[PDB]
Ligand binder design. Sequence first.
Ligand SMILES: [Ca+2]
Length: 240
Amino acid sequence: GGLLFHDEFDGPAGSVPDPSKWQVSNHRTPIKNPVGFDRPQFFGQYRDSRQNVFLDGNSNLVLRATREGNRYFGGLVHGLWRGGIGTTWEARIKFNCLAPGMWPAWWLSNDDPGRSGEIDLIEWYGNGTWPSGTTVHANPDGTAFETCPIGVDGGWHNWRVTWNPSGMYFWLDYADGIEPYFSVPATGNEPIREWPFNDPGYKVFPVLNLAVGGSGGGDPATGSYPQEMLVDWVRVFGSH
Ligand SMILES: [Ca+2]
């Protein structure tokens, strides 16, 4: 009935997420000219290990922050399926990681050469300074963006974006008749607003991650281990 993609994350405790649907990251690319908490000693890695990315046996994906000596690890999964415009994306998430050092996110990525972009449905920052929120990036440099702060607590919540030719609409705990908390219109005058999302054939894939350290996470040495981000499901619906 219009379901294009999902994962309900069913499966035995300790197992890998569905390999036909997700790639588990085994590397977080280092930051160019790093300063502050982007420097290597503060920069938690991604690891394809069941210590950091696993199904819990209760129908959740777990992304877990761990520490081994003075090395820090988080987790990232990258969806192998890509969807275009006229789609509604939603994940049910519990952030058990709203603590210093941590940087969880639920977002959509386009990595096409020359027109990359990203749709950050929700990010929370453990660095004690930046407000949690939602961002649409129309370039990979962070200079063509629309952002909106929204609070994050530790309960189960559904985070949704509907992406159609008119623009992008975001909900927290969507229900019939509720307004989106953030709307980003498609471009309809100089300088021309950067906006690749209405280009023909433009598609994005889902990403879920718990990053440790980096500018958004703050000092991982101040962190608590373990911390976890739980995902009950990711669903993507089309429109007729
Ligand atoms: Ca589930």
